Amino acid sequence: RPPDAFVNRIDRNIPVPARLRHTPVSLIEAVNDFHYAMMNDEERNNFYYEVLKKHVTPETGVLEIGAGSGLLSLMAAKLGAKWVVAVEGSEELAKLARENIRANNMEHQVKVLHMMSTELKSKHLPEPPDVLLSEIFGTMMLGESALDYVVDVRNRLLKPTTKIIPQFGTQYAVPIECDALHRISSVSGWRDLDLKHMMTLQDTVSIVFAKHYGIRMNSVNFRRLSDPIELFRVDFSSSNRNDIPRRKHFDVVAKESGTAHAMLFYWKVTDDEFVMSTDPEDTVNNFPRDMQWGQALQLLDASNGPLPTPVVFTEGKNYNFECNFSGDRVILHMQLC
Amino acid sequence: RPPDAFVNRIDRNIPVPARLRHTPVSLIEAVNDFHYAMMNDEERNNFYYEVLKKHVTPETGVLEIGAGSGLLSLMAAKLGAKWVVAVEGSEELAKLARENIRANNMEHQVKVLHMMSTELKSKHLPEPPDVLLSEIFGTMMLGESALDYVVDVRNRLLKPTTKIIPQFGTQYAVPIECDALHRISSVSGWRDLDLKHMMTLQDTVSIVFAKHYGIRMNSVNFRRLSDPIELFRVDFSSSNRNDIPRRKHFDVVAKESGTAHAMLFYWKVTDDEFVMSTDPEDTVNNFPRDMQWGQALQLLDASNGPLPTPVVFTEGKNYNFECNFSGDRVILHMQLC
Numbered sequence: 305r306p307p308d309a310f311v312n313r314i315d316r317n318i319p320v321p322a323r324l325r326h327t328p329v330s331l332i333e334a335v336n337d338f339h340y341a342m343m344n345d346e347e348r349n350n351f352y353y354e355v356l357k358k359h360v361t362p363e364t365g366v367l368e369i370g371a372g373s374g375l376l377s378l379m380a381a382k383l384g385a386k387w388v389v390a391v392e393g394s395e396e397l398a399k400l401a402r403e404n405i406r407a408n409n410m411e412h413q414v415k416v417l418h419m420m421s422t423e424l425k426s427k428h429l430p431e432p433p434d435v436l437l438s439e440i441f442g443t444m445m446l447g448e449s450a451l452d453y454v455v456d457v458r459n460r461l462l463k464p465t466t467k468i469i470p471q472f473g474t475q476y477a478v479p480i481e482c483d484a485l486h487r488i489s490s491v492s493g494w495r496d497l498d499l500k501h502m503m504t505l506q507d508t509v510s511i512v513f514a515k516h517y518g519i520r521m522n523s524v525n526f527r528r529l530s531d532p533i534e535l536f537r538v539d540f541s542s543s544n545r546n547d548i549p550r551r552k553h554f555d556v557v558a559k560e561s562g563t564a565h566a567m568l569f570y571w572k573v574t575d576d577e578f579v580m581s582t583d584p585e586d587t588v589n590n591f592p593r594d595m596q597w598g599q600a601l602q603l604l605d606a607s608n609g610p611l612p613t614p615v616v617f618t619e620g621k622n623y624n625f626e627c628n629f630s631g632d633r634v635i636l637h638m639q640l641c
Numbered sequence: 642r643p644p645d646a647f648v649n650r651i652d653r654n655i656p657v658p659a660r661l662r663h664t665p666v667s668l669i670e671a672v673n674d675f676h677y678a679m680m681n682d683e684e685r686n687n688f689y690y691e692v693l694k695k696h697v698t699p700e701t702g703v704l705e706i707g708a709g710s711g712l713l714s715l716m717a718a719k720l721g722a723k724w725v726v727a728v729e730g731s732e733e734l735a736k737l738a739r740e741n742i743r744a745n746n747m748e749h750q751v752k753v754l755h756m757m758s759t760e761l762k763s764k765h766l767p768e769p770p771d772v773l774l775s776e777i778f779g780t781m782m783l784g785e786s787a788l789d790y791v792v793d794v795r796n797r798l799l800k801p802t803t804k805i806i807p808q809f810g811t812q813y814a815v816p817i818e819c820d821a822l823h824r825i826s827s828v829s830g831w832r833d834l835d836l837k838h839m840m841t842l843q844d845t846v847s848i849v850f851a852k853h854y855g856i857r858m859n860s861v862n863f864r865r866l867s868d869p870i871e872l873f874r875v876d877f878s879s880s881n882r883n884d885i886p887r888r889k890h891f892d893v894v895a896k897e898s899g900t901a902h903a904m905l906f907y908w909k910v911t912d913d914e915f916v917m918s919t920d921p922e923d924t925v926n927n928f929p930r931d932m933q934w935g936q937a938l939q940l941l942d943a944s945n946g947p948l949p950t951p952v953v954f955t956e957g958k959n960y961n962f963e964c965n966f967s968g969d970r971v972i973l974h975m976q977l978c
Binding site: 324327499630 | 652658661664672680686712719826828832833852854857888928931933942966967973
């Protein structure tokens, strides 16, 4: 029995069925928090199937990294791949993947290795793969270090003809006015009681996922105040970290007048004609995508005074932003200059 | 400089303004995650003001427990209280409360003590208070142990005439059909790929806050399948734990046919004519309340087989549920019998 069995931290007066009792809590949390939603993102599933269908033949060797519960590897097998190797760092997720493979009678076709992709070596595979497959995107595109993990494998285990799926990713930002967001991230007072001192603590640094506010952008009123800002784009078959500057500057032309409460972040991943987007405009009828990825937000302070200063846009004016990145390019920040 | 200064865990290439730099991260997180939203719940603020206004005179001594950033104590002072003592377990929140008090020139009226209410003694107050004031409710009404903390103070520090605000609280449950929730908490398959094994892990035990799914009940389609179930009610001036049974049974009559995907939990707190409710029907135009409290959900398994079984309601039929509580009555679970 695992040290972290689900039943352990449940009150003894509360019933727990057998199927849950001796399963590690981390697995139950991961599957319930993320995996059902991912598996119900029908557009994500169709995207990967269609891109794979262009490349998988009975002579195709397929490697998936960050395989999780293994759905995309099942797809490669479904399309008739010569062999599939799925790599998953979580021991329990790896076992779960093996169960799904067993359930679909694909044990002869799909093998799961419990290890990080960084530990993977040529000897662990029958031959260099014809296809490298992954879905390791975050709410921020590079949020789960997708570029770093793909680059590491790309440097070591592939061959010149290997197709990397998906090929392209672009990270966007757009300044938005959003009164609902403003009302859970600021305060001025209550009647004659002054609460402005609370604003000293306003976090205009962190990137926060909409989920963490409890908010779904598609279910609140917000206004984009400019055309999208392309923060950076990568080609996963060729880009490296140094293709993204540690600091960039953007000239943002206001198309609307309003208060830029926040920068809204979303992304778009493509391969040939197929597209997987977290732009709210593309997710209005994709509730599972909005729950699993959603969008990210950073509150904006116009200056660096003792209190934050609202970023106010007037239609037709130019606004300069400085975007700073962490060394792994996973974390960024937008500041009005 | 604090060991947990905000600036510490920020990337060195990312700017942090002075107002944030040396503030403990826990304070910034607490204020940003919860306090702005609370302070923008205008109905919560009006509820407390109006109830206080019925009781506070220039001869009224007021004790607030779980005072946080101190808004309700400011209200008591505003209404002209003889004295106000605010008790707050967080050292940084206590300091923040003192700042707000300073900002409104009420230092002569409101004192903040940094300690847990359980450590509070008669000597810490000028005299037993005329009013005990608190807002320590969770998404689950008793989620932050409100009854336990009020009872402890009620047993020790008050006088016979002390008015306890707020007086009444009722916790509700209602079985709901909700397709959006279902699509992020279950799966069956993708085309000819079977994913039913994933259902072995479905968490039909935990109470989960809607925020944690990323979901706002007022922004998805759901159907209540029966009249509300009153799980328990308390009078904070007289109830104790043993007024809530460790196990209760409920006969729930289906008013609609559908799948009871989950039990939805909400509550209502009252004092005389005034009401503070987390029923989504009462929060449609209260976005800050839905973000700070929202509602809670527990997925329902109809049986205890190797896979979960949907709870299916047919209009006009009786459904028996067994509700089990933890010893502190904070955690509960509903099971179809």
